[PDB]
Design a binder for this molecule. Structure first.
Ligand SMILES: Nc1ccc(Cl)cc1N1CCN(C(=O)[C@]23C[C@H]4C[C@H](C[C@H](C4)C2)C3)CC1
Length: 248
């Protein structure tokens, strides 16, 4: 059972996590669009861009996130985007889409000019995440914990970040007791898939280097948050788009 303050915190998180969905225009493209590598790749690009917009809105409302330095805010956004995208896509693929949407979406991902050395880890992770059979609250807390990670590059005040991250980890452990009482190692399997999740930072960096992927013009938002051509760092002047979205 949760403390009053853990319950307040959990309700803040859930209210922000739920204000976030995939737009019907994007969902309909999975059926509507022609089936070619170029059009499949552009659907994935539109999903990634929407993922990032949603991630930014969620991030802004994490309790205490607004009390960090603007440059550290940028550094948490940049550092967590890839992991938060793969965690959210796993939720979508396992829990939100009808089975027909999920089957077709997978076919389009497998036929978008991305090499199979990046695809199969993605889907192996999706299956490994799905067998844990997580509730919405576990996805929401795990995403908050990924975002408020005191280990990202360019954070000036890591103690401020760890102090926000520590109460979310307590809540998560209790939630695993409450919703998975049969399995007392559930919490450890969750954090174990955090380890698998971080491997996608390197997979993704490799993917952006691929010659297929560079035959392509990313969206404004993806170029900024993934440093596609940009410079790396968290300087305020170097991320006007992110600052704009952060300031609402
Ligand atoms: N966004 C989403 C929602 C549901 C499901 Cl089943 C899968 C996904 N993707 C998995 C994560 N992704 C990517 O890594 C991408 C990585 C690079 C740059 C973008 C275009 C593609 C090449 C695929 C984003 C987007 C598609």
């Amino acid at each position: 059972e949760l403390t009053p303050d853990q319950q307040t915190l959990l309700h803040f998180i859930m209210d922000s996590y739920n204000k976030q969905r995939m737009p019907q225009e994007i969902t309909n493209k999975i059926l509507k669009e022609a089936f070619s590598a170029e059009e499949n790749f552009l659907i994935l690009t539109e999903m990634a861009t929407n993922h990032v917009q949603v991630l930014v809105e969620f991030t802004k409302k994490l309790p205490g996130f607004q009390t960090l330095d603007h440059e550290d805010q940028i550094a948490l956004l940049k550092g967590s985007a890839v992991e938060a995208m793969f965690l959210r896509s796993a939720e979508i693929f396992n829990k939100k889409l009808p089975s027909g949407h999920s089957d077709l979406l997978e076919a389009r991902i497998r036929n978008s000019g991305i090499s199979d050395e990046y695809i199969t880890p993605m889907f192996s992770f999706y299956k490994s995440i799905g067998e844990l059979k997580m509730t919405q609250e576990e996805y929401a807390l795990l995403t908050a914990i990924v975002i408020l990670s005191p280990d990202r590059q360019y954070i000036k005040d890591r103690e401020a970040v760890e102090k926000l991250q520590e109460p979310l980890l307590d809540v998560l452990q209790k939630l695993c007791k409450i919703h998975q009482p049969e399995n007392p190692q559930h919490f450890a399997c969750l954090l174990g898939r955090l380890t698998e999740l971080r491997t996608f930072n390197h997979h993704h960096a490799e993917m952006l280097m691929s010659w297929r992927v560079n035959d392509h013009k990313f969206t404004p938002l993806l170029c900024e948050i993934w440093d596609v051509g940009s410079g790396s760092g968290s300087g305020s002047g170097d991320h006007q788009l992110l600052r704009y979205l952060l300031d609402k």
